[PDB]
Amino acid sequence: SNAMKKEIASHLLEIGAVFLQPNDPFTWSSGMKSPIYCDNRLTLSYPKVRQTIAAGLEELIKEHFPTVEVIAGTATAGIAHAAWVSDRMDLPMCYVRQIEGKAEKGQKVVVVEDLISTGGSAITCVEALREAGCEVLGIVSIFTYELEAGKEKLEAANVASYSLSDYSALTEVAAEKGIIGQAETKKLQEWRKNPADEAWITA
Amino acid sequence: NLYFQSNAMKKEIASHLLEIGAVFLQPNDPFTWSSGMKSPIYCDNRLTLSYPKVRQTIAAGLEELIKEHFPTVEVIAGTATAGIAHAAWVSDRMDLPMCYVRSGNQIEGKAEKGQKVVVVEDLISTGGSAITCVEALREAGCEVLGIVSIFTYELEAGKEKLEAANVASYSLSDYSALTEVAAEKGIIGQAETKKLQEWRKNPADEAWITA
Ligand SMILES: O=P(O)(O)OC[C@H]1O[C@H](OP(=O)(O)OP(=O)(O)O)[C@H](O)[C@@H]1O
Ligand SMILES: O=P(O)(O)OC[C@H]1O[C@H](OP(=O)(O)OP(=O)(O)O)[C@H](O)[C@@H]1O
Protein backbone atom coordinates (compact mmCIF):
# COMPACT_ATOMS: atom_id res chain seq x y z
CA SER A 1 0.00 0.00 0.00
CA ASN A 2 3.02 2.25 0.53
CA ALA A 3 3.88 1.75 -3.10
CA MET A 4 0.55 3.44 -3.92
CA LYS A 5 1.12 6.22 -1.36
CA LYS A 6 4.51 6.94 -2.90
CA GLU A 7 3.26 6.83 -6.52
CA ILE A 8 0.37 9.17 -5.78
CA ALA A 9 2.67 11.53 -3.83
CA SER A 10 4.95 11.69 -6.83
CA HIS A 11 1.99 12.55 -9.05
CA LEU A 12 0.92 15.41 -6.75
CA LEU A 13 4.48 16.85 -6.77
CA GLU A 14 4.72 16.52 -10.55
CA ILE A 15 1.63 18.65 -11.25
CA GLY A 16 2.12 21.30 -8.59
CA ALA A 17 -0.72 20.03 -6.37
CA VAL A 18 1.67 19.70 -3.44
CA PHE A 19 4.77 21.66 -2.62
CA LEU A 20 7.38 21.49 -0.01
CA GLN A 21 9.32 24.58 1.17
CA PRO A 22 10.57 23.93 4.65
CA ASN A 23 13.34 26.55 4.14
CA ASP A 24 10.85 29.18 2.76
CA PRO A 25 7.59 28.61 4.69
CA PHE A 26 4.09 29.25 3.36
CA THR A 27 1.48 31.13 5.33
CA TRP A 28 -1.94 29.56 5.26
CA SER A 29 -5.20 31.48 5.33
CA SER A 30 -5.35 30.60 9.08
CA GLY A 31 -2.28 32.84 9.55
CA MET A 32 -0.14 29.80 10.53
CA LYS A 33 3.22 29.15 8.90
CA SER A 34 3.61 25.79 7.09
CA PRO A 35 6.28 23.91 5.10
CA ILE A 36 3.66 22.32 2.93
CA TYR A 37 1.01 23.58 0.59
CA CYS A 38 -1.55 21.45 -1.02
CA ASP A 39 -4.04 22.34 -3.69
CA ASN A 40 -5.65 19.19 -4.92
CA ARG A 41 -8.09 21.17 -7.11
CA LEU A 42 -5.26 21.18 -9.67
CA THR A 43 -5.75 17.43 -10.19
CA LEU A 44 -8.85 18.37 -12.20
CA SER A 45 -6.74 19.86 -14.92
CA TYR A 46 -4.71 16.66 -15.58
CA PRO A 47 -6.79 13.88 -17.13
CA LYS A 48 -4.28 10.98 -16.57
CA VAL A 49 -3.56 11.93 -12.98
CA ARG A 50 -7.22 12.37 -11.90
CA GLN A 51 -8.16 8.95 -13.44
CA THR A 52 -5.34 7.26 -11.46
CA ILE A 53 -6.67 8.96 -8.34
CA ALA A 54 -10.23 7.81 -8.97
CA ALA A 55 -8.96 4.27 -9.59
CA GLY A 56 -7.07 4.64 -6.30
CA LEU A 57 -10.14 5.79 -4.38
CA GLU A 58 -12.25 3.02 -5.86
CA GLU A 59 -9.65 0.49 -4.65
CA LEU A 60 -9.60 1.93 -1.09
CA ILE A 61 -13.38 1.79 -1.01
CA LYS A 62 -13.44 -1.86 -2.10
CA GLU A 63 -10.86 -3.02 0.47
CA HIS A 64 -12.08 -0.95 3.46
CA PHE A 65 -15.80 -0.27 2.82
CA PRO A 66 -17.02 -2.97 0.41
CA THR A 67 -20.72 -2.69 1.31
CA VAL A 68 -20.99 0.93 0.14
CA GLU A 69 -24.29 1.98 -1.51
CA VAL A 70 -23.87 5.73 -2.07
CA ILE A 71 -20.92 8.11 -2.57
CA ALA A 72 -20.93 11.54 -0.95
CA GLY A 73 -18.59 14.35 -1.93
CA THR A 74 -17.58 17.43 0.05
CA ALA A 75 -18.43 20.80 -1.49
CA THR A 76 -16.63 21.92 -3.55
CA ALA A 77 -13.22 20.38 -4.26
CA GLY A 78 -14.27 16.69 -3.74
CA ILE A 79 -17.47 16.82 -5.75
CA ALA A 80 -15.56 16.09 -8.97
CA HIS A 81 -13.68 13.19 -7.46
CA ALA A 82 -16.86 11.82 -6.00
CA ALA A 83 -18.31 12.00 -9.50
CA TRP A 84 -15.47 10.03 -11.09
CA VAL A 85 -15.55 7.38 -8.31
CA SER A 86 -19.35 7.03 -8.45
CA ASP A 87 -19.09 6.48 -12.14
CA ARG A 88 -16.39 3.82 -12.00
CA MET A 89 -18.43 2.01 -9.32
CA ASP A 90 -21.82 2.65 -10.94
CA LEU A 91 -23.25 4.09 -7.69
CA PRO A 92 -25.61 6.86 -6.81
CA MET A 93 -24.02 10.07 -5.70
CA CYS A 94 -24.97 12.95 -3.46
CA TYR A 95 -23.14 15.94 -1.97
CA VAL A 96 -23.11 18.07 1.16
CA ARG A 97 -22.67 21.84 1.42
CA GLN A 98 -27.52 20.74 3.20
CA ILE A 99 -27.70 17.33 1.38
CA GLU A 100 -28.26 17.44 -2.40
CA GLY A 101 -29.20 14.29 -4.29
CA LYS A 102 -30.90 11.28 -2.69
CA ALA A 103 -29.37 10.00 0.57
CA GLU A 104 -32.14 7.91 2.11
CA LYS A 105 -32.51 6.46 5.63
CA GLY A 106 -30.20 3.49 6.42
CA GLN A 107 -28.07 3.65 3.24
CA LYS A 108 -24.39 2.85 3.59
CA VAL A 109 -22.39 5.92 2.60
CA VAL A 110 -18.70 6.71 1.96
CA VAL A 111 -17.49 10.30 1.95
CA VAL A 112 -14.87 11.42 -0.56
CA GLU A 113 -12.54 14.30 0.39
CA ASP A 114 -9.52 15.68 -1.34
CA LEU A 115 -7.67 16.81 1.79
CA ILE A 116 -7.70 16.20 5.51
CA SER A 117 -5.90 18.95 7.50
CA THR A 118 -7.98 19.73 10.61
CA GLY A 119 -10.82 17.35 9.76
CA GLY A 120 -13.56 20.00 10.10
CA SER A 121 -15.04 19.59 6.60
CA ALA A 122 -15.09 15.81 6.82
CA ILE A 123 -16.78 15.84 10.24
CA THR A 124 -19.31 18.42 9.22
CA CYS A 125 -20.19 16.34 6.18
CA VAL A 126 -20.34 13.13 8.19
CA GLU A 127 -22.66 14.74 10.74
CA ALA A 128 -25.21 15.77 8.22
CA LEU A 129 -25.28 12.26 6.77
CA ARG A 130 -25.88 10.71 10.18
CA GLU A 131 -28.50 13.37 11.01
CA ALA A 132 -30.40 12.40 7.84
CA GLY A 133 -30.34 8.72 8.96
CA CYS A 134 -27.44 7.36 6.91
CA GLU A 135 -24.81 4.85 8.05
CA VAL A 136 -21.49 6.39 7.27
CA LEU A 137 -19.05 3.58 6.64
CA GLY A 138 -16.10 5.99 6.62
CA ILE A 139 -14.05 8.38 4.57
CA VAL A 140 -11.56 8.21 1.77
CA SER A 141 -9.37 11.13 0.76
CA ILE A 142 -6.64 11.92 -1.67
CA PHE A 143 -4.21 13.19 0.91
CA THR A 144 -3.84 13.89 4.59
CA TYR A 145 -1.33 15.96 6.55
CA GLU A 146 -1.51 13.39 9.44
CA LEU A 147 -1.98 16.22 12.01
CA GLU A 148 -2.78 15.05 15.49
CA ALA A 149 -5.76 17.47 15.83
CA GLY A 150 -7.23 15.81 12.73
CA LYS A 151 -6.90 12.26 14.13
CA GLU A 152 -8.49 13.25 17.43
CA LYS A 153 -11.66 14.60 15.77
CA LEU A 154 -12.05 11.58 13.56
CA GLU A 155 -11.80 9.43 16.73
CA ALA A 156 -14.31 11.59 18.65
CA ALA A 157 -16.78 11.18 15.78
CA ASN A 158 -15.99 7.44 15.47
CA VAL A 159 -15.18 7.70 11.78
CA ALA A 160 -12.65 5.51 9.99
CA SER A 161 -10.50 7.44 7.50
CA TYR A 162 -8.09 6.22 4.83
CA SER A 163 -6.10 8.32 2.40
CA LEU A 164 -4.46 7.55 -0.95
CA SER A 165 -1.29 9.19 0.21
CA ASP A 166 0.03 11.17 3.15
CA TYR A 167 2.66 13.54 4.60
CA SER A 168 5.16 10.84 5.58
CA ALA A 169 5.02 9.08 2.22
CA LEU A 170 5.39 12.46 0.42
CA THR A 171 8.30 13.27 2.72
CA GLU A 172 10.05 9.92 2.12
CA VAL A 173 9.42 10.35 -1.65
CA ALA A 174 10.75 13.88 -1.83
CA ALA A 175 13.96 12.75 -0.05
CA GLU A 176 14.42 9.74 -2.43
CA LYS A 177 14.31 12.09 -5.39
CA GLY A 178 16.71 14.63 -3.77
CA ILE A 179 14.09 17.41 -3.68
CA ILE A 180 14.98 17.73 0.02
CA GLY A 181 17.90 16.79 2.22
CA GLN A 182 18.42 15.56 5.77
CA ALA A 183 18.07 18.94 7.50
CA GLU A 184 14.81 19.74 5.75
CA THR A 185 13.47 16.30 6.65
CA LYS A 186 13.78 17.15 10.37
CA LYS A 187 11.95 20.51 10.01
CA LEU A 188 9.14 18.58 8.27
CA GLN A 189 8.88 15.88 10.94
CA GLU A 190 8.69 18.52 13.72
CA TRP A 191 6.13 20.67 11.95
CA ARG A 192 3.78 17.64 11.90
CA LYS A 193 4.23 17.02 15.68
CA ASN A 194 3.70 20.69 16.68
CA PRO A 195 2.32 22.82 13.77
CA ALA A 196 1.15 25.64 16.11
CA ASP A 197 4.73 26.06 17.42
CA GLU A 198 7.20 27.94 15.15
CA ALA A 199 10.22 25.97 16.41
CA TRP A 200 10.34 23.76 13.34
CA ILE A 201 11.27 26.83 11.25
CA THR A 202 14.77 26.61 12.80
CA ALA A 203 15.08 22.90 13.68
CA ASN B 1 -32.47 15.24 -39.82
CA LEU B 2 -30.91 17.59 -37.27
CA TYR B 3 -34.16 19.12 -36.05
CA PHE B 4 -35.78 15.79 -35.10
CA GLN B 5 -32.58 14.45 -33.49
CA SER B 6 -32.30 17.58 -31.39
CA ASN B 7 -35.97 17.60 -30.30
CA ALA B 8 -36.14 13.83 -29.67
CA MET B 9 -33.27 14.35 -27.21
CA LYS B 10 -35.02 17.36 -25.55
CA LYS B 11 -38.13 15.23 -25.03
CA GLU B 12 -36.27 12.12 -23.78
CA ILE B 13 -34.32 14.20 -21.26
CA ALA B 14 -37.44 16.05 -20.15
CA SER B 15 -39.17 12.70 -19.59
CA HIS B 16 -36.25 11.58 -17.44
CA LEU B 17 -36.34 14.72 -15.36
CA LEU B 18 -40.10 14.22 -14.70
CA GLU B 19 -39.68 10.54 -13.87
CA ILE B 20 -37.04 11.12 -11.16
CA GLY B 21 -38.66 14.20 -9.55
CA ALA B 22 -35.97 16.62 -10.87
CA VAL B 23 -38.70 18.76 -12.49
CA PHE B 24 -42.42 19.29 -11.69
CA LEU B 25 -45.24 21.13 -13.63
CA GLN B 26 -48.26 22.42 -11.73
CA PRO B 27 -49.78 25.37 -13.54
CA ASN B 28 -53.06 24.73 -11.66
CA ASP B 29 -51.26 24.49 -8.23
CA PRO B 30 -48.33 26.99 -8.43
CA PHE B 31 -45.02 26.69 -6.55
CA THR B 32 -43.43 29.61 -4.72
CA TRP B 33 -39.69 29.99 -5.25
CA SER B 34 -37.31 31.07 -2.51
CA SER B 35 -37.31 34.53 -4.20
CA GLY B 36 -41.06 34.91 -3.37
CA MET B 37 -42.23 34.55 -7.01
CA LYS B 38 -44.97 32.07 -7.99
CA SER B 39 -44.09 29.56 -10.67
CA PRO B 40 -45.76 26.65 -12.54
CA ILE B 41 -42.43 24.88 -12.63
CA TYR B 42 -39.89 23.59 -10.09
CA CYS B 43 -36.49 22.22 -10.98
CA ASP B 44 -33.85 20.46 -8.86
CA ASN B 45 -31.32 18.91 -11.24
CA ARG B 46 -29.07 17.84 -8.31
CA LEU B 47 -31.28 14.71 -8.12
CA THR B 48 -29.81 13.47 -11.41
CA LEU B 49 -26.69 12.56 -9.42
CA SER B 50 -28.56 9.77 -7.68
CA TYR B 51 -29.51 8.00 -10.95
CA PRO B 52 -26.49 6.47 -12.73
CA LYS B 53 -28.26 5.72 -16.05
CA VAL B 54 -29.90 9.14 -16.26
CA ARG B 55 -26.75 11.18 -15.46
CA GLN B 56 -24.71 9.21 -18.07
CA THR B 57 -27.33 9.93 -20.72
CA ILE B 58 -27.08 13.60 -19.72
CA ALA B 59 -23.27 13.64 -19.94
CA ALA B 60 -23.48 11.92 -23.37
CA GLY B 61 -25.98 14.56 -24.35
CA LEU B 62 -23.75 17.45 -23.20
CA GLU B 63 -20.75 15.93 -24.96
CA GLU B 64 -22.82 15.84 -28.18
CA LEU B 65 -23.87 19.50 -27.88
CA ILE B 66 -20.25 20.43 -27.31
CA LYS B 67 -19.08 18.54 -30.40
CA GLU B 68 -21.71 20.11 -32.71
CA HIS B 69 -21.59 23.67 -31.46
CA PHE B 70 -18.12 24.12 -29.89
CA PRO B 71 -15.84 21.44 -31.47
CA THR B 72 -12.54 23.25 -30.75
CA VAL B 73 -13.00 23.17 -26.96
CA GLU B 74 -9.83 22.72 -24.87
CA VAL B 75 -11.09 23.02 -21.23
CA ILE B 76 -14.39 22.43 -19.41
CA ALA B 77 -15.55 24.74 -16.64
CA GLY B 78 -18.28 23.90 -14.17
CA THR B 79 -20.39 26.20 -12.03
CA ALA B 80 -20.12 25.74 -8.30
CA THR B 81 -21.74 23.62 -6.98
CA ALA B 82 -24.48 21.77 -8.92
CA GLY B 83 -22.66 21.69 -12.31
CA ILE B 84 -19.30 20.56 -10.98
CA ALA B 85 -20.35 16.87 -11.12
CA HIS B 86 -21.69 17.20 -14.66
CA ALA B 87 -18.61 19.04 -15.75
CA ALA B 88 -16.63 16.17 -14.29
CA TRP B 89 -18.50 13.53 -16.28
CA VAL B 90 -18.25 15.51 -19.51
CA SER B 91 -14.54 16.26 -19.06
CA ASP B 92 -13.97 12.59 -18.58
CA ARG B 93 -15.85 11.38 -21.63
CA MET B 94 -13.95 13.97 -23.68
CA ASP B 95 -10.60 13.46 -21.96
CA LEU B 96 -10.21 17.21 -21.31
CA PRO B 97 -8.86 19.31 -18.48
CA MET B 98 -11.35 20.75 -16.08
CA CYS B 99 -11.59 23.77 -13.82
CA TYR B 100 -14.40 25.39 -11.86
CA VAL B 101 -15.65 28.90 -10.86
CA ARG B 102 -17.08 29.86 -7.45
CA SER B 103 -19.01 33.28 -7.22
CA GLY B 104 -10.09 30.50 -1.99
CA ASN B 105 -9.59 31.64 -5.64
CA GLN B 106 -12.55 32.37 -7.94
CA ILE B 107 -11.18 30.11 -10.71
CA GLU B 108 -9.87 26.80 -9.34
CA GLY B 109 -7.79 24.51 -11.54
CA LYS B 110 -5.73 25.64 -14.52
CA ALA B 111 -7.47 27.96 -16.99
CA GLU B 112 -4.62 29.56 -18.87
CA LYS B 113 -4.58 32.54 -21.22
CA GLY B 114 -6.03 31.89 -24.69
CA GLN B 115 -7.51 28.46 -23.97
CA LYS B 116 -10.90 27.69 -25.54
CA VAL B 117 -13.40 27.06 -22.72
CA VAL B 118 -16.98 25.75 -22.48
CA VAL B 119 -19.02 26.33 -19.34
CA VAL B 120 -21.36 23.59 -18.04
CA GLU B 121 -24.47 24.60 -16.05
CA ASP B 122 -27.37 22.52 -14.84
CA LEU B 123 -29.99 25.25 -15.10
CA ILE B 124 -30.48 28.65 -16.79
CA SER B 125 -33.27 30.79 -15.25
CA THR B 126 -32.18 34.52 -15.19
CA GLY B 127 -28.70 33.85 -16.60
CA GLY B 128 -26.86 35.60 -13.71
CA SER B 129 -24.67 32.67 -12.67
CA ALA B 130 -23.68 31.83 -16.19
CA ILE B 131 -22.74 35.48 -17.02
CA THR B 132 -20.76 35.88 -13.81
CA CYS B 133 -18.87 32.63 -14.51
CA VAL B 134 -18.24 33.68 -18.13
CA GLU B 135 -16.94 37.10 -17.12
CA ALA B 136 -14.34 35.62 -14.82
CA LEU B 137 -13.05 33.31 -17.57
CA ARG B 138 -12.70 36.22 -20.03
CA GLU B 139 -11.02 38.36 -17.37
CA ALA B 140 -8.43 35.63 -16.79
CA GLY B 141 -7.70 35.69 -20.57
CA CYS B 142 -9.75 32.67 -21.75
CA GLU B 143 -11.81 32.46 -24.92
CA VAL B 144 -15.26 31.27 -23.88
CA LEU B 145 -16.75 29.39 -26.78
CA GLY B 146 -20.15 29.18 -25.08
CA ILE B 147 -22.32 27.40 -22.54
CA VAL B 148 -24.12 24.13 -22.36
CA SER B 149 -26.73 23.33 -19.72
CA ILE B 150 -29.09 20.54 -18.82
CA PHE B 151 -32.17 22.65 -18.79
CA THR B 152 -33.44 26.17 -19.32
CA TYR B 153 -36.65 27.89 -18.57
CA GLU B 154 -36.35 29.91 -21.88
CA LEU B 155 -37.08 33.22 -20.06
CA GLU B 156 -36.77 36.30 -22.24
CA ALA B 157 -34.73 38.20 -19.59
CA GLY B 158 -32.25 35.25 -19.69
CA LYS B 159 -31.84 35.38 -23.50
CA GLU B 160 -31.25 39.12 -23.49
CA LYS B 161 -28.33 38.94 -21.04
CA LEU B 162 -26.71 36.05 -22.93
CA GLU B 163 -26.89 38.22 -26.07
CA ALA B 164 -25.51 41.34 -24.30
CA ALA B 165 -22.55 39.21 -23.12
CA ASN B 166 -22.19 37.59 -26.61
CA VAL B 167 -22.41 34.12 -25.24
CA ALA B 168 -23.97 31.31 -27.23
CA SER B 169 -26.01 28.98 -25.02
CA TYR B 170 -27.49 25.63 -25.83
CA SER B 171 -29.44 23.36 -23.49
CA LEU B 172 -30.06 19.64 -23.46
CA SER B 173 -33.78 20.23 -22.87
CA ASP B 174 -36.08 23.14 -22.23
CA TYR B 175 -39.44 24.43 -21.01
CA SER B 176 -41.27 23.97 -24.29
CA ALA B 177 -40.10 20.39 -24.79
CA LEU B 178 -40.99 19.62 -21.18
CA THR B 179 -44.38 21.23 -21.84
CA GLU B 180 -45.05 19.16 -24.98
CA VAL B 181 -43.92 16.03 -23.07
CA ALA B 182 -46.07 16.76 -20.00
CA ALA B 183 -49.07 16.97 -22.28
CA GLU B 184 -48.21 13.62 -24.00
CA LYS B 185 -48.28 11.99 -20.55
CA GLY B 186 -51.55 13.66 -19.44
CA ILE B 187 -49.89 15.59 -16.62
CA ILE B 188 -51.46 18.70 -18.16
CA GLY B 189 -53.64 19.47 -21.25
CA GLN B 190 -54.42 22.27 -23.74
CA ALA B 191 -56.28 24.46 -21.18
CA GLU B 192 -53.07 24.78 -19.03
CA THR B 193 -50.92 25.34 -22.07
CA LYS B 194 -51.84 29.00 -22.18
CA LYS B 195 -50.94 29.56 -18.47
CA LEU B 196 -47.56 27.99 -19.17
CA GLN B 197 -46.86 30.09 -22.30
CA GLU B 198 -47.70 33.34 -20.49
CA TRP B 199 -45.63 32.52 -17.41
CA ARG B 200 -42.60 32.18 -19.72
CA LYS B 201 -43.24 35.60 -21.33
CA ASN B 202 -43.89 37.45 -18.03
CA PRO B 203 -42.90 35.44 -14.95
CA ALA B 204 -42.90 38.47 -12.65
CA ASP B 205 -46.58 39.11 -13.48
CA GLU B 206 -49.19 36.91 -11.72
CA ALA B 207 -51.67 37.09 -14.59
CA TRP B 208 -50.71 33.65 -15.83
CA ILE B 209 -52.25 32.13 -12.69
CA THR B 210 -55.71 32.86 -14.15
CA ALA B 211 -55.06 32.91 -17.86
O1 LIG C 1 -9.74 19.20 7.07
P2 LIG C 1 -10.02 20.67 6.88
O3 LIG C 1 -9.17 21.51 7.78
O4 LIG C 1 -11.49 21.04 6.81
O5 LIG C 1 -9.49 21.08 5.45
C6 LIG C 1 -9.91 20.36 4.31
C7 LIG C 1 -10.78 21.16 3.33
O8 LIG C 1 -10.08 22.19 2.62
C9 LIG C 1 -10.57 22.23 1.28
O10 LIG C 1 -11.85 22.88 1.20
P11 LIG C 1 -12.26 24.42 1.44
O12 LIG C 1 -13.44 24.39 2.36
O13 LIG C 1 -11.02 25.21 1.82
O14 LIG C 1 -12.74 25.00 0.01
P15 LIG C 1 -13.45 24.27 -1.24
O16 LIG C 1 -14.83 24.92 -1.22
O17 LIG C 1 -12.53 24.69 -2.37
O18 LIG C 1 -13.53 22.76 -1.03
C19 LIG C 1 -10.91 20.80 0.91
O20 LIG C 1 -12.04 20.70 0.02
C21 LIG C 1 -11.34 20.21 2.24
O22 LIG C 1 -12.77 20.08 2.31
O1 LIG D 1 -29.34 31.35 -14.19
P2 LIG D 1 -29.56 31.69 -12.72
O3 LIG D 1 -30.79 32.51 -12.47
O4 LIG D 1 -28.36 32.10 -11.91
O5 LIG D 1 -30.02 30.36 -11.98
C6 LIG D 1 -29.37 29.15 -12.29
C7 LIG D 1 -28.62 28.69 -11.05
O8 LIG D 1 -29.51 28.63 -9.94
C9 LIG D 1 -28.94 27.67 -9.04
O10 LIG D 1 -28.19 28.43 -8.11
P11 LIG D 1 -27.84 27.85 -6.66
O12 LIG D 1 -26.69 28.73 -6.25
O13 LIG D 1 -29.20 27.78 -5.99
O14 LIG D 1 -27.29 26.34 -6.93
P15 LIG D 1 -25.98 25.53 -6.34
O16 LIG D 1 -25.37 26.31 -5.20
O17 LIG D 1 -26.65 24.25 -5.90
O18 LIG D 1 -25.02 25.42 -7.52
C19 LIG D 1 -28.04 26.70 -9.84
O20 LIG D 1 -26.66 26.66 -9.45
C21 LIG D 1 -28.07 27.27 -11.23
O22 LIG D 1 -26.76 27.20 -11.80
Q: How far is the CA of A76 from the centre of ligand 1 (A)?
A: 8
Q: Is B60 on the interface with A (CB under 8 A)?
A: no
A77: left (phi over 0), alpha (psi -120 to 50) or beta: alpha
CATH architecture, domain defined by B1-211: 3-Layer(aba) Sandwich (3.40)
B170 to chain A, minimum CA–CA distance in Å? Answer: 23
Instruction: Report the 3 state secondary structure along chain A.
Output: CHHHHHHHHHHHHHCCCEEECCCCCEECCCCCEECEEECHHHHHHCHHHHHHHHHHHHHHHHHHCCCCCEEEEECCCCHHHHHHHHHHHCCCEEEECCEECCCCCCCEEEEEEEEECCCHHHHHHHHHHHHCCCEEEEEEEEEECCCHHHHHHHHHCCCCEEEEEEHHHHHHHHHHHCCCCHHHHHHHHHHHHCCCCCCHHHC
Question: What are the sequence ranges of the domains in chain B?
Answer: 1-211
Given this structure, which CATH class describes domain A1-203?
A: alpha beta
Determine whether the shortest distance from the Cβ of B78 to ligand 2 is under 6 A: no
| Angstrom resolution of this structure | 2.7
Is-contact A163 A143, C-beta < 8 A?
Answer: yes
B24 closest CA partner among B35, B10, B36, B14: B14
Beta bridge partners of B99: B77
Q: Is B131 on the interface with A (CB under 8 A)?
A: no
Q: What three-state secondary structure class fits B41? A: strand
List the determination method. X-ray
